[PDB]
Amino acid sequence: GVPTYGAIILDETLENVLLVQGYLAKSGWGFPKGKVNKEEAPHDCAAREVFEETGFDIKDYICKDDYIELRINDQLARLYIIPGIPKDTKFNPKTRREIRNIEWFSIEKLPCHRNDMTPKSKLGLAPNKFFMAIPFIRPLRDWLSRRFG
Numbered sequence: 017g018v019p020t021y022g023a024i025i026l027d028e029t030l031e032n033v034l035l036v037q038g039y040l041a042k043s044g045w046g047f048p049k050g051k052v053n054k055e056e057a058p059h060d061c062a063a064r065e066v067f068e069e070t071g072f073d074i075k076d077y078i079c080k081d082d083y084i085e086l087r088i089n090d091q092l093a094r095l096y097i098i099p100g101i102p103k104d105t106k107f108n109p110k111t112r113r114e115i116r117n118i119e120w121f122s123i124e125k126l127p128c129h130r131n132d133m134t135p136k137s138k139l140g141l142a143p144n145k146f147f148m149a150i151p152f153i154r155p156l157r158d159w160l161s162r163r164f165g
């Protein structure tokens with residue numbers, strides 16, 4: 017699995033996080049991130065992917081130790097945590113061919129799991145447009161509690 021890098025951008029209240037909506041298999045909402053290039057350092061890949069997807073440069077804000085990393089299906093995803101970005105920042109992807117929309121979401125309102133279908137006695141999970149973000153939500157809330165209060 018080629019590792020991916022990106023960011024969790026939060027506003028100044030720490031309430032809201034910046035998600036991006038793709039197309040097709042990436043049609044839902046997720047954190048801005050993408051695959052590392054040959055010989056590219058993690059921090060540079062995170063900044064490149066975030067600038068390509070949001071038009072916002074995190075380079076001067078990345079902290080080396082402040083990230084959440086998950087291994088999903090034997091692919092590693094690491095999102096640098098970037099707090100205090102004002103909600104009135106103008107975000108604009110580099111190309112609309114990959115990114116449909118960019119929005120702030122309330123962290124407390126986001127799901128941290130998908131819903132089963134126990135009502136229908138059917139196995140599996142109900143669709144959720146936050147599926148790409150979900151795995152990071154509980155680890156984020158725990159990280160924020162520890163590092164802030």
Ligand SMILES: C1CCCC(Nc2nnc(C3CC3)o2)CC1
Binds near residue numbers: 037
């Ligand atoms: C569109 C822009 C690129 C970021 C993307 N984030 C994402 N999180 N998981 C995946 C799947 C590959 C496993 O993608 C979704 C939004």
